[PDB]
């Protein structure tokens, strides 16, 4: 029998923390309408009174309005929703004192779920940013139109990073195979000021093109073996788990 607790500004506003194994004591005096508030996103399915004729019911979205329509209307309210199902113990105060205008619910279940998901997201993000166990290859040469050249190129075993200055137009970078044929390679632009082009492959030779100027990049320390991707993500500290099941 969860008896709610009133505000300090006025006794007529009362709060209760939800619990799926307890009911709430609702006092429905004569001549007042009580505002039962559901949380946002909650989908009402149905409800059931202890006496449909005893009380008045009115719903608009997620707002419940009740009102005693008869004497000795001491019954129970059970309103089921998409997420949870509430439980009320309606009981009129025959003295018309201690009226309740709103019943506000505080939900520890959704709060716990949000805290869990936020903690999991924070852990995944920390694991991504930590990037420990990283080895960097800096043996890169270039020959061609040096005016479109990176100020830095390196790779971490999985991706190749080309860094460009702030006054340089970002060029288009292609993948060169053994016979000399260029082909597209997927690209992501990273860096605090979008100055780094990260291509998703480690390769011995690269082609940088901007307009009618061309520059060839050479990985002088190409490692064919690389680092195996057992986790499914860019980091060794984050897994990719099969949610879909099926």
């Amino acid at each position: 029998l969860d008896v709610p607790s009133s505000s300090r500004y006025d006794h007529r506003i009362r709060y209760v923390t939800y619990n799926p194994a307890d009911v709430v004591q609702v006092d429905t005096v004569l001549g007042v309408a009580t505002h039962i508030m559901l949380e946002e996103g909650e989908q009402y399915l149905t409800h059931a009174f202890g006496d449909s004729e005893a009380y008045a019911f009115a719903r608009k979205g997620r707002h419940i309005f009740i009102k005693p329509q008869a004497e000795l209307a001491n019954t129970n309210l059970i309103v089921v929703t998409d997420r949870r199902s509430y439980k009320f113990r309606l009981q009129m105060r025959n003295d018309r004192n201690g009226a309740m205008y709103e019943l506000a619910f505080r939900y520890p279940d959704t709060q716990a779920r949000q805290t869990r998901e936020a903690n999991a997201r924070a852990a995944v993000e920390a694991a991504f940013e930590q990037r420990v166990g990283a080895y960097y290859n800096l043996k890169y040469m270039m020959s061609g139109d040096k005016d479109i050249a990176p100020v830095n190129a390196w790779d971490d075993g999985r991706f190749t990073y080309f860094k460009f200055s702030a006054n340089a137009d970002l060029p288009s970078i292609y993948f060169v195979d053994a016979e000399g044929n260029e082909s597209l390679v997927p690209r992501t632009t990273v860096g605090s000021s979008n100055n780094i082009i990260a291509v998703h492959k480690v390769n011995p030779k690269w082609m940088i093109r901007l307009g009618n100027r061309a520059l060839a990049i050479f990985n002088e320390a190409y490692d064919p073996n690389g680092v195996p991707n057992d986790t499914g993500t860019a980091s060794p500290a984050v897994r990719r788990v099969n949610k879909g099941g099926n």
């Binding site: 890169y140 040469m141 270039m142 020959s143 050249a149 390196w154 990073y161």
Partner: peptide, 28 residues
């Protein structure tokens, strides 16, 4: 009798290091 032109091929004579200085994204 007509074939589409190729893009410019870079010259191979001025081969030089790309990294004059270590980047700070390696934290060095």
């Amino acid at each position: 009798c007509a074939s589409a032109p190729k893009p410019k091929q870079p010259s191979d004579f001025n081969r030089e290091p790309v990294n004059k200085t270590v980047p700070v994204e390696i934290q060095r």
